[PDB]
Amino acid sequence: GSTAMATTMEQEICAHSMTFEECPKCSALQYRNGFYLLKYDEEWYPEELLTDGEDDVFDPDLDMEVVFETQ
Ligand SMILES: [Zn+2]
Numbered sequence: 001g002s003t004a005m006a007t008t009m010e011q012e013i014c015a016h017s018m019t020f021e022e023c024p025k026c027s028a029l030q031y032r033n034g035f036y037l038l039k040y041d042e043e044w045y046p047e048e049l050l051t052d053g054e055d056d057v058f059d060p061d062l063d064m065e066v067v068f069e070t071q
Pocket of ligand 1: 015026
């Protein structure tokens with residue numbers, strides 16, 4: 001194709017919407033779509049994305065305190 005990585009034709013061809021170059025951004029490797037944070041269909045999607053679950057956790061359970069089952 002063109003002189004681009006992974007023979008990108010610059011016509012946005014991938015499993016997902018973007019180009020091969022933009023595949024990691026498209027979360028092509030993951031096959032889990034990055035956009036739409038609140039995914040009702042997917043389980044604990046915002047939590048998975050969040051580095052720290054302290055804000056998004058109920059009061060009786062503290063992620064910091066318990067090493068196991070940390071979100
Ligand atoms: Zn892609």
